[PDB]
Amino acid sequence: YSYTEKKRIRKDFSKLPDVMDVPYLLAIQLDSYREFLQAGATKEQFRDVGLHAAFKSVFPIISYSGNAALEYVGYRLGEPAFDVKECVLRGVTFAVPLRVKVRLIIFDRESSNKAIKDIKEQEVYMGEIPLMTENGTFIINGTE
Amino acid sequence: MAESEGLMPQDLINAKPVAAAIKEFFGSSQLSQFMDQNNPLSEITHKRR
RNA sequence: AUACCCUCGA
């Protein structure tokens, strides 16, 4: 028996049992975005949909009549620059930076592992994701 | 046509199109719209829409 | 002080 209800009891006329408690109301939005972001990454991040899915979708790049590819490694989400209240006060869109690790591997076009020069480094800041707030919304230019 | 020594990965990728697309979707898409905040119930029924 | 888009009322 919780403390909040101890203040006022509603007389309920329920003549049927509560087999299942009402689920969280905004889960349909919060689940989708947190699955799209994949904040929790293991040694192998989940192969499900998301930014990771799109990056793997565009992973192999073959140069036109050239021996050079851009392999993608796991991306790294940035840290929020501002707190959501601060963004509402200022209009900072509550965004978080996005960065990914890519490897530029060139070859000698000898149909084998020739001209071994693999340059792997974290790519440029590929924009910023708005990082939906805990209440199911997100701030864009100071407006919810 | 650029060389592996002549070009670095940070200098090849231009991130402007992806940022522009994300901003356009998040600010001007039909499904992106201001939350109805006159009621706490309005917010719930807007997010479950 | 011009065009679209969204939402709402009868």
Side-chain angles (χ1 to χ4, degrees), chain A residues 1-11 13-14 16-31 33-41 50 52-58 60-61 63 66 68-70 72 74-78 80-88 91 95 97-101 103 115-116 127 130-133 135-143, chain B residues 2 6 9-10 13 15-33 36-49:
Chain A
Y1 217 80
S2 91
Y3 155 71
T4 283
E5 36 156 28
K6 284 180 157 194
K7 306 202 155 191
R8 185 173 44 182
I9 292 331
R10 285 233 169 204
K11 158 73 195 193
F13 299 97
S14 287
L16 39 89
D18 241 352
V19 47
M20 151 175 193
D21 180 23
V22 166
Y24 182 77
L25 254 181
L26 298 187
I28 218 76
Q29 283 226 320
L30 285 159
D31 264 17
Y33 211 68
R34 78 164 147 255
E35 162 155 9
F36 151 80
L37 274 194
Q38 302 269 324
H52 171 269
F55 276 121
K56 303 316 139 279
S57 175
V58 198
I61 308 181
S63 176
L70 292 181
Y72 293 141
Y75 61 95
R76 179 188 77 258
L77 267 171
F82 285 67
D83 165 36
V84 51
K85 169 61 195 69
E86 310 174 330
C87 317
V88 180
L98 176 52
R99 283 172 208 146
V100 65
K101 270 175 268 296
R103 341 186 170 150
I116 318 295
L131 174 75
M132 150 171 318
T133 321
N135 292 317
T137 171
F138 39 54
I139 322 296
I140 316 291
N141 319 120
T143 79
Chain B
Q10 284 78 244
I13 272 183
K16 281 76 61 164
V18 83
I22 284 297
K23 154 173 271 293
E24 199 199 292
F25 158 71
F26 269 98
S28 315
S29 158
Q30 282 135 32
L31 299 199
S32 175
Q33 52 198 4
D36 287 342
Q37 267 179 340
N38 44 6
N39 275 356
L41 156 77
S42 283
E43 315 178 1
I44 299 302
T45 192
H46 205 143
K47 304 164 200 174
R48 302 170 45 73
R49 172 133 285 180

